[PDB]
A paper describes a structure:
However, when combined with LspMrs, crystals and a structure of the complex to 2.30 Å resolution were obtained by the in meso method using monoolein as the host lipid. Overall, the structure of the protein in the myxovirescin complex is very similar to that of the complex with globomycin. Differences were noted at the C-terminus that was fully formed as an extended helix in the myxovirescin complex but was disordered, and without useful electron density in the globomycin complex. By contrast, myxovirescin binds with its macrocycle docked on the left side of the pocket with the EL extended out and over the ring. However, despite this marked difference in docking mode and approach to the active site, the 6-OH of myxovirescin wedges firmly between the two catalytic aspartates inhibiting the enzyme, just like globomycin, as a non-cleavable tetrahedral intermediate analog. Indeed, the 6-OH of myxovirescin and the β-OH of g.Ser, hereafter referred to as blocking hydroxyls, superpose to within 0.8 Å in the two complex structures. The similarities do not end there. Tracking along the myxovirescin molecule from the 6-OH to the [-4NH-3C(O)-] amide linkage we find the latter hydrogen bonded to the catalytic Asp136 and to Arg110. In the myxovirescin complex, the loop has unfolded fully and extends deeper into the substrate-binding pocket enabling the benzene ring of Trp57 to contact the macrocycle locking it in position against the opposite side of the pocket surface. By contrast, in complex with LspMrs, myxovirescin assumes the shape of an ovaloid disc bent at its broad end. In myxovirescin, the apolar part situates partly below the overarching β-cradle.
The pathway in Gram-negative bacteria employs the prolipoprotein diacylglyceryl transferase, Lgt, to dagylate the pre-prolipoprotein, LspA to cleave off the signal peptide from the proliprotein and the apolipoprotein N-acyltransferase, Lnt, to perform a final N-acylation step. LspA is essential in Gram-negative bacteria, it has no mammalian equivalents and its active site is accessible to potential drugs at the outer surface of the inner membrane. The enzyme consists of four transmembrane helices (H1-H4) with the catalytic dyad aspartates, Asp118 and Asp136, towards the membrane’s outer surface. Extending away from the catalytic dyad and to one side of the bundle of transmembrane helices is the β-cradle, a hemi-cylindrically shaped sheet that sits on the membrane.
Author numbering: -1, 1 to 163
Write the structure that this text describes.
């Protein structure tokens, strides 16, 4: 065969699709809804409630926009470095890095523009009394799950031969 080093076209489409979907949903919630309003999509399981977060996960480190600014630039540059140096010929890793990149960039735009993050996903399917999050948060969590899956799987991949 002819194996490929960088699935760059797929990785860009993935990141572009997530950031567009994240920014549009954030905009229409902040435009067509007041804070505290709640709409019902799946009763008792999923609602859309306008919410604002000036901090990180679970509202930790609230009001530290300079810290979020620096640490997100470090993350974005680190993801680009690992894409080129350690993820070549690995489509699974390149997809996970793109989801991490899109998620970090999505929340980074909100903090730079407004100094806070719009959150509207209000559900209990992934656990009860779970904080209200957004699409950028979902992409981040998803990419982290794939990263730990790939590396945990390769702990059991130490087998000498590669051909029958
Ligand atoms: C999830 C990415 C968090 C995201 O970090 C970001 O921005 C990126 C750029 C990096 C941060 C600046 C650095 C913090 C370290 C990560 C952290 O904090 C602990 C890790 C727990 C987490 C990962 C395994 C699982 C569960 C959390 C949540 C559930 O996610 C579905 C939180 C959803 C609601 O708290 C919602 O209000 C959050 C709000 O939207 C702002 N978003 C952020 O801060
Ligand atoms: C989220 C899904 C985003 C859509 C990502 C799929 C794009 C794609 O796979 O296109 C591959 C094609 O070969 C172009 O390089
Ligand atoms: C999650 C989205 C899954 C992305 C898969 C896209 C894909 O399969 O692209 C193949 C590539 O274009 C050729 O090998
Ligand atoms: C970020 C996306 C920038 C476009 C991708 C790119 O830089 O293309 C690499 C080119 O092939 C280098 O020779
Ligand atoms: C909150 C997360 C903050 C920073 C994560 C950034 C992680 C950056 C880790 C850099 C370590 C590194 O690059 O090591 C080189 C490696 O050995 C070459 O393959
Ligand atoms: C919580 C934020 C994530 C914790 C820091 C990520 C761990 C990390 O930096 O990984 C480096 C990479 O694995 C080097 O090969
Ligand atoms: C938790 C939500 C906040 C977001 C925090 C994101 C921080 C992640 C930073 C870099 C990840 C880059 C992943 C690079 C994966 C490649 C690992 C690798 O190749 O290392 C091989 C080594 O030999 C095996 O130990
Ligand atoms: C979910 C959709 C899965 C699509 C995966 C396609 C794919 O992985 O392409 C293989 C590549 O050509 C070689 O690694
Ligand atoms: C938003 C735009 C790009 C996000 C892409 C995020 C995934 C990081 C891709 C890193 C990259 O640019 O790869 C260049 C490589 O040289 C290719 O040939
Ligand atoms: Zn009912
Ligand atoms: Zn909050």
């Amino acid at each position: 065969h002819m194996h490929k080093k960088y699935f760059i076209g797929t990785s860009i489409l993935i990141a572009v699709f997530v950031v567009i979907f994240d920014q549009v949903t954030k905009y229409i919630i902040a435009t067509t809804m007041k804070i505290g309003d709640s709409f019902e999509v799946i009763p008792h399981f999923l609602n859309i409630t306008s919410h604002r977060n000036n901090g990180a996960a679970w509202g930790i480190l609230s009001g530290k926009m300079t810290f979020f600014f620096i640490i997100t630039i470090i993350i974005l540059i680190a993801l680009v470095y690992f894409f080129i140096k350690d993820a070549q010929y690995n489509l699974f890793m390149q997809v996970a890095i793109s989801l991490l990149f899109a998620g970090a960039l999505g929340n980074f735009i909100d903090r730079v523009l407004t100094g806070e993050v719009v959150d509207f996903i209000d559900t209990n399917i992934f656990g009860y009394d779970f904080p209200i999050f957004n699409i950028a948060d979902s992409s981040l969590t998803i990419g982290v799950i794939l990263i730990i899956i790939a590396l945990l799987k390769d702990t059991s991949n130490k087998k000498e031969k590669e051909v029958k």
